[PDB]
Curated annotation (Swiss-Prot):
Keywords: Acetylation, Electron transport, Endoplasmic reticulum, Heme, Iron, Membrane, Metal-binding, Microsome, Transmembrane, Transmembrane helix, Transport. The chain holds residues 8 to 89 of 134 of the full protein. The gene is CYB5A. It comes from the Eukaryota. This is Cytochrome b5. It is a single-pass membrane protein.
Amino acid sequence: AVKYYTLEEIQKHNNSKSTWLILHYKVYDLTKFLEEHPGGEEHLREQAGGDATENFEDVGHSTDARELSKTFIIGELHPDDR
Ligand code: HEM
């Protein structure tokens, strides 16, 4: 099951450290995808450390990517943060 991560924790993950984000309350860790993703690292890192839901959706995404997102997630932003 998900362990949750407070935005305090999420805030620590936005560098070589690791790159987290929040898409739809769900927390992400994408520190390698930084390499592969057509956005580049910069454009994930830019958002990274939480809430990238708006950028993710304004750009928006395919099913493929939403499915990928499951194996890029680590859990949720905690309910004591939402
Ligand atoms: C959860 C991790 C994500 C995955 C699996 C992912 C996957 C992909 C894939 C497969 C594409 C091609 C378009 C498609 O068919 O969806 C793409 C394009 C793109 N992604 Fe992501 N992405 C993720 C998160 C993000 C986030 C949070 C951002 C930054 C705000 C972002 C920015 C972009 C941009 C800029 C494009 C191309 C837009 C254009 O065509 O100009 N992505 N991504």
